[PDB]
Amino acid sequence: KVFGRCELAAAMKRHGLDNYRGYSLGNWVCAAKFESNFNTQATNRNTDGSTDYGILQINSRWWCNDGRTPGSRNLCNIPCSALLSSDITASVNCAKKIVSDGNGMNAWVAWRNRCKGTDVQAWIRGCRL
Ligand SMILES: [O-][Cl+3]([O-])([O-])[O-]
Ligand SMILES: [O-][Cl+3]([O-])([O-])[O-]
Ligand SMILES: [O-][Cl+3]([O-])([O-])[O-]
Ligand SMILES: [O-][Cl+3]([O-])([O-])[O-]
Ligand SMILES: [O-][Cl+3]([O-])([O-])[O-]
Ligand SMILES: [Cl-]
Ligand code: NI
Numbered sequence: 627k628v629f630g631r632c633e634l635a636a637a638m639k640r641h642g643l644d645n646y647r648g649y650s651l652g653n654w655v656c657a658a659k660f661e662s663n664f665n666t667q668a669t670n671r672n673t674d675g676s677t678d679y680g681i682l683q684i685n686s687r688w689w690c691n692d693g694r695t696p697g698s699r700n701l702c703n704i705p706c707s708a709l710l711s712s713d714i715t716a717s718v719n720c721a722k723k724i725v726s727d728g729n730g731m732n733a734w735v736a737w738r739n740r741c742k743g744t745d746v747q748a749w750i751r752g753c754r755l
Contacts (some may be wrong), residue, residue, distance in 0.1 A: 627712035632753035652746035
C-alpha cells in the first residue's frame with residue numbers, strides 16, 4: 627500500500643509511535659517518507675547484500691528474516707515479507723525495538739541525514755490527529 631502522509635501519521639499514532647523513545651510523530655513520518663516514500667512494499671538491496679523492507683526499510687541483517695542475508699539476526703522475530711503488509715503493525719513493533727537499541731532514530735541513516743534537526747512537525751501539519 628502507498629500511504630497518504632496524514633494517513634500514515636494516524637496509523638503510526640494509533641500504534642503508539644508519537645513520542646515513542648521521545649521522537650515526536652513527525653520524525654517517524656519524515657523517516658518513512660525518505661526511506662520508502664510511504665510505500666509498504668518497498669524493498670532495497672543494501673551494499674552488504676542485506677535488504678531493507680517496508681515503510682521504514684527495516685533491514686534483514688539484524689531485524690527480520692528473508693533467508694538470503696548470511697550472518698543475519700532476526701531480532702524482531704518475523705519474516706521480512708511481514709514488513710511489506712498494508713497493515714504496519716509488524717513494522718511499527720519492529721521499529722520500536724530498533725529505536726530502542728541505543729542510537730535512537732540515527733539507526734535510520736536517512737532520518738539522521740534528512741530529518742534530524744529539521745522542522746519535522748511540518749510532516750504532520752494539516753493532519754486531523
Ligand atoms: O505527500 Cl508528502 O511526500 O508531501 O508526505
Ligand atoms: O544492531 Cl545492534 O543490536 O549492535 O545495536
Ligand atoms: O526534507 Cl529534509 O531531507 O530537508 O528534512
Ligand atoms: O514529530 Cl512532530 O509532531 O514535531 O511533527
Ligand atoms: O485527544 Cl483527542 O481525541 O480529543 O483530539
Ligand atoms: Cl546466516
Ligand atoms: Ni486528537
